Each structure stands twice: as C-alpha cells, then as structure tokens.
Amino acid sequence: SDPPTACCFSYTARKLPRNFVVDYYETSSLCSQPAVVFQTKRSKQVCADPSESWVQEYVYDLELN
Amino acid sequence: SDPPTACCFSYTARKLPRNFVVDYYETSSLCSQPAVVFQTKRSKQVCADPSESWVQEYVYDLELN
Amino acid sequence: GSDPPTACCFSYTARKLPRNFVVDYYETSSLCSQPAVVFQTKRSKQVCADPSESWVQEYVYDLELN
Amino acid sequence: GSDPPTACCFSYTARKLPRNFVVDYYETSSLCSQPAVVFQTKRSKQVCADPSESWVQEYVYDLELN
Amino acid sequence: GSDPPTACCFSYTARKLPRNFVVDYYETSSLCSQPAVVFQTKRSKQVCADPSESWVQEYVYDLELN
Amino acid sequence: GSDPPTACCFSYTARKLPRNFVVDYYETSSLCSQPAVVFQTKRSKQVCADPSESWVQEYVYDLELN
Amino acid sequence: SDPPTACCFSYTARKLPRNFVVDYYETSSLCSQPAVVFQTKRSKQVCADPSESWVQEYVYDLELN
Amino acid sequence: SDPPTACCFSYTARKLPRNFVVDYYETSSLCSQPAVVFQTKRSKQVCADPSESWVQEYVYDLELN
Amino acid sequence: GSDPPTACCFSYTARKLPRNFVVDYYETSSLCSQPAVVFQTKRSKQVCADPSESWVQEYVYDLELN
Amino acid sequence: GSDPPTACCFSYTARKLPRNFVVDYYETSSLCSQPAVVFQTKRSKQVCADPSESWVQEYVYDLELN
C-alpha cells in the first residue's frame, strides 16, 4: 500500500546486551540518515548508530548465525 | 527510549471511505514532509496528504467527535 | 524492512474470486503505474483485481467493516 | 497465479551490502517502470539495488560464476 | 506519534523497589542530560532509577529476559 | 509524587493546532534543555510547541485567562 | 512544570487503622528524609515514618492488592 | 496534624504574566532553600526564585493591594 | 502556608459533644506535648478531646468511614 | 470555647518580614513549650517569629508605640 516508513532521528547511547536483542532491520534509504533498528526480547524497538562497532557486530551476527 | 519515527514519503492516492477510518495521527515535524497517517478497521496504516481536504475533514471529525 | 521491492499489478483477474477463499486484501502503492486491489486467499494466493469493479469493492467493504 | 502482483523497485538502497550477507539475486520484471537487481540476504531479506552501480554489477557477476 | 514530550530523569529514587512492585521498565532517550531507567510499578507509578546501581540492572535483566 | 520523570521537548510541532483541538496546556520544567509549551488535545494527545510563536502564546493566554 | 515537592519533616505518632487509608505515595529523594505519605478516606494527608513496620505493611498491601 | 510540607528544589525560569497569578505563599523555613509558590488562574502552582526582582514585585503587590 | 503556628491541646473536654454538632476532626501534631483529637462543629467551634476516650474514637471512626 | 486548641510555634521563620507586610502581632500562650511572637500580615497570614531576634523585638516595639 502506502504505509509510513520507519526513520531514526536519534540513536541510543547505550550498547545493548547481546541477549536483549532478537532481531534487526535497516531503515529505508529515503530516511534522512542511515540507521539500524534492533528489536528486543520484550519487543521494544531501538534506533542504533550504524557507525559503531557494537552495532555492526550484532548485525553481522543476526544475519550470519 | 530511542525508537523509530513514522514518516511518509509517498501518500495514498484514493480517498478513504470515512467508515474505514478509526483513528489518525500526524507525523513528527522531524520528517521531511507533513503527513497524516490514518488507521483503518483492519488495523492498517496509510499515509495521507494533509493538503487534501478530505484529509483535513476526517481529522477534525476524529479529534472533535 | 529497508528498501524492499513494491508489489504492483499489471493485469486484473477476469474471473471473480469465491468470497470465502478471500481472507485479506491490500491496495497497491501509488508509486505503481495503475491502482489495484490485491486479494489474499487462505492458501496465500495473491490475486490482482480492478478497483473499478463492483464485486472488488463489495469484497473490500466486507473485509474492512465485517 | 493467473494474475499475481509483480515485484518492482522504485527506491534503491544507498548502502553497499556486505557481500557475505548476499546469497542470491533476481531481476525485476520488464513490466517495471525501471530495471533493478533485487539481492536476497542470508535472512531472506530483499534489497532493491540500482543496476547502474558497480558493486551491484560485480555482486551479480560473482554470484553467477563462483 | 507526532512531537510529544520526551521523558527525562533529573533525579533518581534513593529507595530500592521491592522486585514485586515492578512490572515493566524502559530507558530514557539518549537526548536527555543523563541516562536513566524508569520502572513502572504494579500501581502503575513511574520511578526514575540510577542505571549504575546493582538492583537496577538486576531488575532490568530479569524484566528483559524472564 | 516521588521521583517520576520530567517531560521535556527536544523538538516543536511545525504545524499549528486548530484552537478547538486544544483543551489544556502546561510549560516544561526549567530543568529541561529548552523552554516549551505542551498542549493537550481533545483526543488527549500531547504536542510540544515553540513558546516563541504567536499562536502558541495566544492559546496559552486564552487557556489561562478565559 | 516547576511545582512544589511534598516533604516530611515531622511524622505522625499513631498507627493508622488500615481502613482509614485509601492510597499512599513516597516523598521525593530530594527531601532530607525518607517518608511515606498516606491518604485517608477524608482525603487528608499524613506523613509516616518508613522505618516503622506498619508503614511498610500498608505499602505492600496498597501496591500489591 | 502532621501533613507534608511544600518545598522547592527548582525555580521556574520564566517570568509569569501578572494576570496569570492570583496568589502566593512562601515555603516553610524547614525546606532546604527559600522559595515563593505562585498560584495561577488555572490553579497551577509554581516555584519561583525569591532573589529575583519580578517575584518580589508580585509578592509585594499581592500582599499590599 | 509558611511557618504558621501549630494547634495543640492542653486540656480535654469533659462534656461529650452531641454527634450531630460535629462535621470534621483532626489529630494534633506530634510536635505537641500530648496527643489530641480536635473536633469541629458546624459553627466552626473547636473542641479538644482525649483520644483514649471511647466516644472520641467512636466519632473519629464514623467521620472517617461514613 | 471550653477547651479550644492553643496556637504554638515549634519552627520559626528564617526570613525577616517586610515591615510593611505586618499589621499586628500576638504572643503565644505560656502553656507552649517555647515563647514566640506571631506576626500577622496584611493578608491575615500568620508567621511564627523567634523572640531572640532583634528584628522581631523591634517590630513589636514599633507596633506598640507607633
């Protein structure tokens, strides 16, 4: 259809514990800046800065393993 | 927390029948364009151009009544 | 999702879908070349339909209100 | 089906995907307004990629003959 | 969601909450002047807590995992 | 009242609210990084507004006096 | 906004009958001493010493039940 | 009885419009710092710094006139 | 209020107050030399009473629960 | 009344009142644990003042003979 798109205008400042995270997605390229959104065990959603080591590590891990 | 913000880059082109709509909200000023998001009875979410009048009409009705 | 593809209809069904086959529907994006209802069945079959048809709209109404 | 929706890309990804995320590709229908490669990740995600881009071309080539 | 206000803690509770008073939590936006955990009580109250305390991170884990 | 979180606005609505959407307001704590007026709508929503705008101070007066 | 904070400098000396109490709250950590404030059926407000046990008892009961 | 006492730990930063204010009181001397609390037309309550000109002016005025 | 005086009882009434005279009651501050119920009548008469008396406590209960 | 509550001061004001706020005074009962002057403002507010303080003494004197 024509749903709204998820964008991030601010990033969490805290590294999340690995086992708090159960999934991720990357925000559209239409958004004004790049971002990763992590889904948690309690199903919360968290904007996270893709420039940071820990974010990439979790992304690599959720994708590959 | 630091969750995603809903943003509309593309708007629906049809006019929604009034009775398909149960709720609405308006996208953050941080988005690159103004938008109204309508919620339908099937719990779907549709971007809508706030410059269209039926959009304004339904918004006043949902707010006031 | 990120930058996934959009669903678009380039033809409309010519045969009416049995109403009880259909469990859901969506409208295709306005980015598409033409408007279209996509009907969804229980076995997850996807059927493009002409929005200007009367049974299409009748189905859409039943799905949305009932 | 008899008249299924077609996958089309209108917006591309601005990111170069990690090659090791990508396990497959496919090209969008000629019926689409524009040509696109859609990459498919290990996780079954779908990423529209702009065929004009060199990484996109290189990725396809590598998938095909490797 | 439009432009509603953000929850920020400028002070932390100095008392420790009995674990069975708590039923949920969240952390404050990075936009705030300091980090904080906000617990939600059975009676539906909201309590700013210092994230550097042991009980605070214990509760958060327990809430998040179990 | 114990140690609940403080409401702070980090961004202001860019739209002007129809006067008859609004039914109450408050101003944010001086503890916040910037000043702000938060309006409460008929549908009970909360909207951060820029205190330096004309309509914002008009509404506030009207709400406060009449 | 920027309203006053409730603080207890003197505590009540009697034990409130349970059924006089309808609600409670706990004074901000900014105050100079810990306190529980009980609300009565006549909507009065009574500081109470959190170190006293009937105080704790009633608090658990109001929260849990 | 033994009610809680109103204390202020932070002061408004905005000078209130005179006709928003309908009353004042001064906070107990038991509180950790001196303060004035203004009551408004809508019956809100506002901690205000007594060191400031505008506060004293309103205090003088509500007292004398 | 600011630093207003406290109400304290230094004697207790020796005559029982007609129950229907009484519309409200309060307990005197613990800062006082002795405990006391202060009963309030319709014409705003203030009457100190011994908390250990049975009619005093009976009145207090009726006022608080009914 | 037959046994009315007595006004007593346990805490004093740390502020020197503006002389022009004060329209009257009275002294608390000898039954009180401590001696106090209670000032009465234009607005009928009541302020316990510490008789040890010079401004308090001066205020009383001025009220009495002026």
XYZ file of C-alpha atoms in Angstrom:
656
model
C 0.000 0.000 0.000
C 1.390 3.388 1.107
C 2.356 2.750 4.764
C 4.586 5.038 6.802
C 8.315 4.378 6.843
C 10.494 3.966 9.933
C 13.141 6.633 10.257
C 15.619 7.419 13.049
C 16.488 10.949 14.107
C 18.430 9.971 17.235
C 20.466 6.883 18.267
C 20.608 5.026 21.549
C 23.734 5.906 23.504
C 23.942 2.628 25.355
C 25.358 -0.617 23.982
C 22.630 -3.202 24.350
C 23.358 -6.561 25.956
C 23.546 -9.132 23.144
C 20.775 -11.326 24.552
C 18.404 -8.406 24.862
C 18.437 -8.335 21.048
C 16.421 -10.767 18.924
C 16.394 -9.033 15.531
C 17.288 -6.024 13.455
C 16.399 -4.184 10.339
C 17.957 -1.304 8.461
C 15.933 1.882 7.857
C 14.857 2.918 4.355
C 17.244 4.898 2.170
C 14.503 7.531 1.903
C 15.159 8.464 5.540
C 17.449 11.427 6.138
C 20.206 9.344 7.714
C 21.257 5.661 7.932
C 20.266 3.614 10.955
C 19.727 0.122 12.328
C 16.661 -0.714 14.395
C 17.050 -3.505 16.937
C 14.107 -5.493 18.203
C 14.379 -6.660 21.787
C 13.153 -9.649 23.778
C 10.300 -7.505 25.129
C 9.659 -6.376 21.557
C 10.837 -2.793 22.079
C 12.480 -1.078 19.090
C 15.739 0.825 19.282
C 17.459 3.180 16.873
C 21.203 2.494 16.870
C 24.084 4.233 15.058
C 25.490 2.038 12.228
C 28.871 3.744 12.512
C 29.583 1.972 15.794
C 31.473 -1.276 16.226
C 28.970 -2.983 18.519
C 26.053 -2.332 16.145
C 27.842 -3.863 13.156
C 28.851 -6.819 15.294
C 25.238 -7.590 16.173
C 24.149 -7.009 12.617
C 26.767 -9.427 11.291
C 25.769 -11.927 13.939
C 21.995 -11.803 13.472
C 22.446 -12.062 9.728
C 25.002 -14.879 9.626
C 24.280 -17.052 12.704
C 13.529 5.281 24.747
C 15.007 5.847 21.279
C 12.508 4.226 18.847
C 11.848 4.906 15.113
C 9.709 7.815 13.939
C 6.905 7.244 11.389
C 7.458 9.261 8.224
C 5.553 9.492 4.913
C 7.446 9.761 1.646
C 4.600 8.553 -0.577
C 0.887 9.299 0.017
C -2.142 7.191 -0.844
C -3.954 8.366 -3.954
C -7.514 7.279 -3.137
C -9.972 8.912 -0.761
C -10.686 6.593 2.131
C -14.351 5.978 2.874
C -14.962 7.677 6.225
C -16.086 4.443 7.879
C -12.861 2.637 7.038
C -11.054 5.007 9.371
C -10.951 4.529 13.145
C -8.034 6.758 14.197
C -5.259 9.039 12.961
C -2.003 10.637 13.959
C 0.286 13.231 12.486
C 3.909 12.577 11.565
C 6.698 14.231 13.571
C 7.884 17.649 12.436
C 11.285 15.991 12.053
C 10.071 14.238 8.908
C 10.828 15.844 5.557
C 7.183 16.338 4.696
C 3.928 16.916 6.623
C 1.634 13.928 6.743
C -1.416 12.408 8.375
C -1.484 8.688 8.998
C -4.900 7.050 9.073
C -5.615 3.784 10.889
C -8.238 1.532 9.316
C -10.605 -1.054 10.782
C -8.272 -3.806 9.678
C -5.549 -2.012 11.628
C -3.613 -0.999 8.550
C -1.797 2.324 8.276
C -1.997 4.671 5.319
C -0.063 7.863 4.647
C -2.279 10.699 3.503
C -1.569 14.143 2.084
C -2.514 16.789 4.713
C -3.033 19.283 1.907
C -6.022 17.318 0.664
C -9.305 18.442 2.161
C -10.942 15.119 2.917
C -7.785 14.543 4.942
C -8.476 17.706 6.952
C -12.183 16.848 7.163
C -11.607 13.432 8.716
C -9.031 14.866 11.145
C -11.399 17.420 12.555
C -14.030 14.711 12.869
C -11.770 12.220 14.662
C -10.498 14.927 17.048
C -13.741 16.737 17.841
C -16.145 13.792 17.765
C 12.022 -3.531 6.263
C 14.635 -1.452 4.400
C 14.408 -0.825 0.635
C 12.365 -3.907 -0.359
C 10.512 -4.121 -3.708
C 6.962 -2.854 -4.116
C 4.039 -5.009 -5.264
C 2.405 -3.768 -8.496
C -0.415 -5.058 -10.708
C -0.045 -5.180 -14.474
C -3.196 -7.186 -15.138
C -6.537 -7.683 -13.361
C -8.253 -11.007 -12.830
C -11.068 -11.780 -15.263
C -12.655 -14.416 -13.050
C -14.491 -13.473 -9.856
C -12.882 -14.908 -6.705
C -15.131 -17.018 -4.479
C -15.751 -14.758 -1.492
C -14.886 -17.419 1.095
C -11.487 -18.014 -0.487
C -10.547 -14.451 0.473
C -9.203 -13.578 3.946
C -7.443 -10.246 3.378
C -6.731 -7.551 0.805
C -4.437 -4.627 0.246
C -4.197 -1.684 -2.097
C -1.080 -1.366 -4.205
C 1.284 1.544 -3.754
C 0.544 4.823 -5.525
C 4.065 4.577 -6.912
C 2.636 1.932 -9.267
C 1.551 2.608 -12.856
C -2.071 1.797 -12.055
C -4.287 1.282 -8.975
C -5.159 -2.258 -7.923
C -6.644 -4.256 -5.112
C -4.591 -7.340 -4.288
C -6.793 -10.040 -2.728
C -5.322 -12.717 -0.480
C -6.649 -16.233 -0.025
C -6.266 -18.811 2.731
C -3.532 -20.668 0.844
C -1.824 -17.299 0.410
C -2.641 -16.946 -3.255
C -2.286 -13.314 -4.445
C -4.820 -12.008 -6.996
C -4.721 -8.553 -8.660
C -8.206 -7.031 -9.211
C -9.666 -3.946 -10.909
C -10.679 -1.455 -8.208
C -13.419 -0.131 -10.533
C -15.249 -3.428 -10.450
C -18.273 -3.770 -8.221
C -17.504 -7.142 -6.718
C -13.976 -5.976 -5.930
C -15.341 -3.012 -3.997
C -18.011 -5.168 -2.441
C -15.320 -7.513 -1.149
C -13.187 -4.644 0.075
C -16.130 -3.290 2.087
C -16.997 -6.616 3.648
C -13.359 -7.180 4.619
C -12.922 -3.772 6.158
C -16.208 -3.477 8.083
C -17.010 -7.098 8.996
C -1.195 -17.383 -10.169
C -3.365 -16.208 -13.081
C -2.700 -12.511 -12.345
C -0.206 -12.171 -9.431
C 1.376 -8.867 -8.296
C 4.827 -8.058 -9.693
C 7.825 -7.061 -7.558
C 9.138 -3.639 -8.639
C 11.794 -1.294 -7.222
C 11.133 2.425 -7.035
C 13.768 3.373 -4.451
C 17.229 1.796 -4.254
C 19.441 1.092 -1.246
C 22.156 3.704 -0.692
C 24.242 1.165 1.212
C 26.666 -1.293 -0.276
C 25.645 -4.626 1.258
C 28.299 -6.852 2.826
C 28.993 -9.473 0.143
C 28.685 -12.223 2.718
C 25.097 -11.221 3.506
C 24.016 -11.860 -0.091
C 23.120 -15.392 -1.181
C 21.147 -14.735 -4.361
C 19.726 -12.181 -6.749
C 16.960 -11.756 -9.233
C 15.987 -9.150 -11.742
C 12.658 -7.354 -11.670
C 10.102 -7.787 -14.466
C 10.488 -5.836 -17.711
C 6.989 -4.571 -16.968
C 8.500 -2.447 -14.165
C 8.979 1.270 -14.722
C 12.677 0.794 -14.058
C 15.275 -2.006 -14.103
C 16.543 -3.307 -10.779
C 18.527 -6.094 -9.194
C 16.998 -7.415 -6.002
C 19.516 -9.023 -3.672
C 18.406 -11.674 -1.213
C 20.211 -11.934 2.119
C 21.002 -14.970 4.247
C 17.924 -13.948 6.243
C 15.625 -13.829 3.175
C 15.543 -10.021 3.237
C 15.083 -8.325 -0.126
C 17.132 -5.339 -1.190
C 16.474 -3.321 -4.332
C 19.758 -2.353 -5.918
C 20.487 0.150 -8.669
C 21.949 -1.718 -11.705
C 23.919 1.441 -12.606
C 26.157 0.802 -9.596
C 29.389 -1.113 -9.983
C 29.153 -3.063 -6.765
C 25.737 -4.292 -7.886
C 27.148 -5.472 -11.215
C 30.146 -7.067 -9.524
C 27.957 -8.865 -6.988
C 25.787 -10.363 -9.724
C 28.808 -11.486 -11.732
C 30.344 -13.101 -8.682
C 27.157 -14.942 -7.803
C 26.764 -16.195 -11.339
C 30.298 -17.533 -11.900
C 31.592 -18.538 -8.424
C 3.443 9.677 17.288
C 3.983 13.361 16.385
C 6.006 15.712 18.584
C 5.131 14.563 22.120
C 7.460 15.330 25.040
C 10.356 13.072 25.972
C 10.636 11.546 29.444
C 13.817 12.616 31.243
C 15.114 11.935 34.765
C 16.885 14.718 36.595
C 16.965 12.774 39.864
C 16.996 9.107 40.864
C 14.975 7.365 43.543
C 17.121 6.748 46.597
C 14.975 3.861 47.732
C 15.173 0.345 46.338
C 11.923 -1.033 44.972
C 10.726 -4.461 46.077
C 11.023 -6.621 42.968
C 7.334 -7.465 43.034
C 6.324 -3.836 42.860
C 7.857 -3.668 39.380
C 6.193 -4.952 36.213
C 7.957 -3.107 33.395
C 10.685 -0.588 32.611
C 12.190 1.495 29.860
C 15.358 3.537 29.448
C 15.306 7.277 28.744
C 16.113 8.795 25.399
C 19.772 9.486 24.700
C 18.571 13.060 24.152
C 18.313 13.532 27.942
C 21.063 15.098 30.042
C 21.785 11.814 31.763
C 20.977 8.115 31.415
C 18.176 6.607 33.436
C 15.968 3.570 33.909
C 12.291 4.242 34.590
C 10.420 1.439 36.361
C 6.664 1.035 36.217
C 5.008 -0.261 39.374
C 2.058 -2.563 39.945
C 0.083 0.507 40.981
C 1.198 1.996 37.666
C 3.590 4.588 39.073
C 6.826 5.626 37.347
C 10.136 5.734 39.200
C 13.419 7.136 37.897
C 16.317 4.850 38.873
C 20.120 5.182 38.678
C 21.368 2.803 35.946
C 24.654 2.322 37.784
C 23.042 0.543 40.743
C 23.149 -3.210 41.113
C 19.472 -3.748 41.834
C 18.535 -1.527 38.910
C 20.473 -3.644 36.401
C 19.336 -6.819 38.091
C 15.673 -5.880 37.654
C 16.236 -4.769 34.084
C 17.781 -8.100 33.154
C 15.108 -10.072 34.889
C 12.379 -7.997 33.213
C 14.025 -8.218 29.838
C 14.932 -11.914 29.807
C 12.422 -13.733 32.049
C 4.850 12.468 43.798
C 8.222 10.719 44.290
C 10.906 10.695 41.596
C 8.890 10.414 38.364
C 10.386 11.539 35.042
C 10.169 15.121 33.829
C 8.552 15.986 30.497
C 10.979 17.689 28.108
C 10.621 18.835 24.488
C 13.558 18.379 22.163
C 11.527 19.358 19.100
C 8.489 21.538 18.415
C 5.470 20.789 16.266
C 5.745 22.603 12.958
C 2.009 22.581 12.441
C -0.410 24.999 14.068
C -3.193 23.394 16.069
C -6.788 24.452 15.467
C -7.792 26.262 18.651
C -10.656 23.867 19.273
C -8.367 20.870 19.313
C -6.744 22.264 22.461
C -8.211 21.998 25.958
C -5.240 22.495 28.278
C -1.507 23.170 28.382
C 1.486 23.311 30.660
C 5.043 24.595 30.366
C 8.075 22.328 30.757
C 10.309 22.314 33.782
C 13.140 24.832 33.799
C 15.335 21.750 34.242
C 14.919 20.944 30.523
C 17.432 21.980 27.869
C 14.985 24.411 26.330
C 11.651 26.062 27.113
C 8.464 24.609 25.722
C 4.683 24.686 25.878
C 2.918 21.322 25.769
C -0.696 21.414 24.575
C -3.217 18.714 25.379
C -5.748 17.939 22.662
C -9.406 16.974 22.786
C -8.333 13.458 21.844
C -5.944 13.701 24.791
C -2.719 13.887 22.794
C 0.306 15.945 23.861
C 2.044 18.333 21.477
C 5.312 20.170 22.092
C 5.067 23.768 20.838
C 7.616 26.577 20.365
C 6.939 29.238 23.037
C 8.201 31.968 20.721
C 5.349 31.540 18.230
C 2.394 33.885 18.160
C -0.330 31.257 18.112
C 1.353 29.405 20.958
C 1.255 32.432 23.273
C -2.203 33.335 22.066
C -3.562 29.913 23.032
C -1.755 29.973 26.352
C -3.307 33.301 27.283
C -6.736 32.256 26.189
C -6.439 28.978 28.121
C -5.072 30.690 31.179
C -7.440 33.662 31.363
C -10.737 32.610 29.732
C 6.119 22.478 35.146
C 8.022 23.584 38.259
C 5.670 22.807 41.200
C 6.440 22.181 44.923
C 7.660 18.817 46.193
C 5.975 17.169 49.216
C 8.421 16.635 52.065
C 8.027 15.267 55.618
C 9.909 16.865 58.488
C 7.642 15.545 61.249
C 5.929 12.116 61.224
C 2.617 11.088 62.752
C 2.988 9.201 66.013
C -0.115 6.993 65.897
C -0.684 3.863 63.839
C -3.418 4.477 61.310
C -6.200 1.904 61.245
C -5.786 0.108 57.915
C -9.276 1.061 56.745
C -8.646 4.773 57.181
C -6.099 4.556 54.390
C -7.046 4.616 50.706
C -3.737 5.466 48.998
C -0.088 6.362 49.560
C 2.935 7.868 47.901
C 6.581 8.209 48.751
C 8.369 11.538 49.103
C 10.989 12.559 46.528
C 14.575 11.500 47.161
C 15.349 15.223 47.106
C 13.776 15.597 50.543
C 16.051 15.491 53.576
C 14.423 12.390 54.991
C 12.625 9.313 53.595
C 8.891 9.321 54.108
C 5.612 7.712 53.142
C 2.537 9.877 52.850
C -0.791 8.181 53.483
C -4.091 9.461 52.089
C -7.157 8.901 54.260
C -10.843 8.494 53.431
C -11.442 12.103 54.352
C -8.741 12.990 51.832
C -6.279 14.152 54.448
C -2.540 13.576 54.138
C -0.314 12.230 56.882
C 3.458 11.860 56.954
C 4.571 8.478 58.215
C 7.941 7.052 59.204
C 9.025 4.475 56.561
C 11.151 2.776 59.198
C 8.039 1.724 61.083
C 6.728 -1.672 60.068
C 3.013 -0.995 59.875
C 4.092 1.675 57.404
C 5.838 -0.966 55.283
C 2.928 -3.380 55.768
C 0.319 -0.969 54.429
C 2.570 -0.017 51.492
C 2.941 -3.558 50.293
C -0.806 -4.003 50.649
C -1.728 -0.849 48.715
C 0.759 -1.698 45.934
C 0.129 -5.423 45.549
C -3.603 -5.512 46.269
C -1.919 17.096 62.160
C 1.389 16.030 60.559
C 0.846 16.878 56.858
C 3.630 17.069 54.292
C 5.314 20.406 53.683
C 5.763 22.117 50.316
C 9.380 22.547 49.334
C 11.001 23.788 46.111
C 14.119 22.230 44.634
C 13.977 24.097 41.317
C 12.580 27.501 40.218
C 10.651 28.475 37.124
C 12.871 30.238 34.606
C 10.102 32.249 33.024
C 8.616 35.460 34.405
C 4.900 34.859 34.714
C 2.418 37.350 33.292
C 0.975 39.301 36.236
C -2.633 38.341 35.499
C -1.790 34.665 35.350
C -1.076 34.963 39.085
C -3.832 35.036 41.711
C -1.913 34.238 44.905
C 1.334 33.276 46.546
C 2.778 31.711 49.603
C 6.284 31.335 50.949
C 7.695 27.846 51.617
C 8.460 26.655 55.152
C 11.800 27.507 56.736
C 12.294 23.763 57.238
C 12.808 23.410 53.478
C 16.400 23.354 52.262
C 16.130 26.667 50.424
C 13.816 29.726 50.339
C 11.110 29.944 47.705
C 7.810 31.538 46.735
C 4.987 29.462 45.287
C 2.595 31.262 42.956
C -0.929 30.053 42.370
C -2.286 30.683 38.900
C -5.701 31.378 37.397
C -5.930 27.710 36.370
C -4.823 26.811 39.893
C -1.391 25.508 38.886
C 1.435 26.003 41.405
C 4.834 27.392 40.513
C 8.113 27.509 42.397
C 9.792 30.876 41.830
C 13.174 32.234 42.983
C 12.753 34.916 45.710
C 16.054 36.514 44.723
C 14.531 37.885 41.527
C 13.021 41.320 41.055
C 9.809 40.201 39.363
C 8.989 37.703 42.130
C 9.344 40.295 44.893
C 7.256 42.717 42.868
C 4.359 40.269 42.674
C 4.767 39.351 46.302
C 4.637 43.000 47.366
C 1.633 43.521 45.139
C -0.430 40.511 46.220
C 0.260 41.334 49.843
C -0.425 45.076 49.749
C -3.080 45.578 47.026
C 1.380 28.201 54.286
C 4.879 29.145 55.506
C 5.868 28.896 59.191
C 2.396 29.250 60.765
C 1.689 28.199 64.383
C 0.650 24.663 65.274
C -2.588 23.771 67.070
C -2.038 21.994 70.415
C -4.356 20.743 73.168
C -3.602 21.421 76.816
C -6.939 20.219 78.161
C -9.609 17.743 77.017
C -13.333 18.378 77.058
C -15.204 16.834 79.983
C -18.592 17.010 78.293
C -19.472 14.724 75.384
C -20.176 16.606 72.138
C -23.544 15.939 70.503
C -22.632 13.824 67.485
C -24.648 15.915 65.019
C -22.837 19.087 66.054
C -19.634 17.573 64.658
C -18.731 17.810 60.949
C -14.968 17.209 60.936
C -11.992 16.337 63.122
C -8.236 16.406 63.044
C -5.382 14.992 65.062
C -2.931 17.427 66.584
C 0.687 17.475 65.505
C 3.128 15.037 67.097
C 5.254 18.075 67.890
C 2.718 18.760 70.662
C 3.208 17.789 74.314
C 0.287 15.366 74.201
C -1.948 13.680 71.589
C -5.429 15.067 70.994
C -8.354 14.884 68.647
C -9.704 18.316 67.749
C -13.398 18.101 66.809
C -15.010 20.708 64.576
C -18.643 21.772 64.642
C -20.907 23.419 62.084
C -20.434 26.862 63.633
C -16.694 26.186 63.495
C -16.286 25.631 67.203
C -13.016 23.793 68.012
C -13.063 21.210 70.835
C -10.004 19.316 72.166
C -10.780 15.687 73.166
C -8.931 12.795 74.823
C -8.022 10.252 72.132
C -8.214 7.479 74.765
C -11.910 8.043 75.264
C -14.346 5.685 73.609
C -16.798 8.225 72.282
C -13.920 10.227 70.821
C -12.718 7.183 68.905
C -16.260 6.267 68.002
C -16.727 9.711 66.477
C -13.408 9.538 64.679
C -14.424 6.227 63.083
C -17.819 7.446 61.970
C -16.269 10.575 60.454
C -13.582 8.711 58.586
C -15.622 5.783 57.221
C -19.102 7.286 56.758
C -14.616 27.609 73.790
C -14.490 25.425 76.916
C -11.306 23.630 75.775
C -10.048 25.145 72.467
C -6.697 24.280 70.813
C -3.780 26.620 71.541
C -1.575 28.196 68.859
C 2.080 27.230 69.418
C 5.264 27.773 67.387
C 7.771 24.967 67.006
C 9.647 26.249 63.948
C 10.424 29.922 63.305
C 10.677 31.845 60.038
C 14.252 32.342 58.823
C 13.170 35.378 56.813
C 12.920 38.911 58.073
C 9.432 40.015 57.013
C 8.991 43.335 55.213
C 7.787 45.703 57.949
C 5.007 46.927 55.699
C 3.537 43.423 55.442
C 2.995 43.260 59.210
C -0.136 44.801 60.723
C -0.255 43.109 64.123
C 1.313 40.629 66.495
C 0.424 38.396 69.364
C 2.320 36.247 71.776
C 1.748 32.522 72.114
C 0.360 31.004 75.324
C 2.669 30.386 78.286
C 1.466 26.797 78.037
C 3.566 26.458 74.855
C 6.871 24.612 75.014
C 8.578 27.760 73.782
C 7.920 31.519 73.623
C 7.091 33.037 70.253
C 5.807 36.170 68.595
C 3.325 35.508 65.824
C 3.161 38.280 63.246
C 0.003 38.821 61.237
C 0.310 40.125 57.682
C -1.968 42.426 55.710
C -3.322 39.212 54.181
C -4.078 37.582 57.569
C -1.137 35.189 57.207
C 0.488 34.069 60.447
C 4.234 33.947 60.902
C 5.959 32.457 63.932
C 8.935 34.584 64.860
C 11.799 33.858 67.234
C 11.702 36.402 70.126
C 15.510 36.099 70.419
C 15.829 38.003 67.141
C 16.302 41.750 67.138
C 14.088 42.488 64.178
C 11.282 40.640 65.953
C 11.747 42.748 69.084
C 11.985 45.943 67.054
C 8.846 45.107 65.078
C 6.838 44.539 68.253
C 8.081 47.770 69.812
C 7.209 49.713 66.693
C 3.722 48.254 66.515
C 3.094 49.003 70.159
C 4.229 52.649 70.229
C 3.623 53.994 66.681
